[PDB]
């Protein structure tokens, strides 16, 4: 299973990491790592900033995990446009809570993409949360029960 994702210089989108091949520039305090992306090959390999542009993989959200998605959060969000659909950093502007049903979460999230400042209302299917929001599932168990 993939553990990490990395931001591509081509498009500013985030992609799953297949392997870290090498690293450099540690002595600078700002190391880079040579990334082989999942589903791609050697041609798409990049040197990527370790501190800011590599991270633990975002978590596709299901069911009542929506309680861990709050206004203000950074999320990784699937941006479906006219001719492309890629995962981009976005911030949640608003969380509209709605009745869950047999297919799970019906909540709607107004998001703003960080790279183009565009705004969209998305369903939970498009939302991947950062692992550092997991703790909220423990706090908000009663909200999960309510949903």
């Amino acid at each position: 299973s993939v553990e990490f994702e990395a931001k591509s210089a081509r498009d500013g989108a985030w992609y799953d990491v297949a392997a870290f091949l090498s690293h450099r520039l540690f002595e600078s305090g700002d190391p880079e790592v040579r990334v082989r992306f999942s589903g791609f090959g050697a041609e798409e390999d990049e040197w990527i900033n370790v501190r800011k542009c590599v991270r633990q993989r975002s978590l596709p959200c299901e069911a009542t995990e929506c309680v861990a998605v709050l206004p203000g959060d950074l999320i990784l969000c699937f941006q479906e446009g006219k001719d492309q659909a890629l995962y981009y950093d976005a911030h949640v502007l608003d969380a509209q809570r709605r009745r869950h049903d047999v297919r799970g979460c019906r909540c709607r999230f107004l998001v703003r993409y960080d790279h183009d400042s565009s705004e969209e209302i998305v369903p939970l299917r498009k939302v991947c949360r950062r692992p550092e929001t997991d703790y909220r599932l423990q706090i908000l168990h009663a909200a999960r029960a309510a949903a």
Partner: peptide
């Protein structure tokens, strides 16, 4: 890990 939605890529240029 759960599967992400499949990326759809394009060259741009329109």
């Amino acid at each position: 890990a759960r599967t992400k939605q499949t990326a759809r890529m394009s060259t741009g240029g329109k």
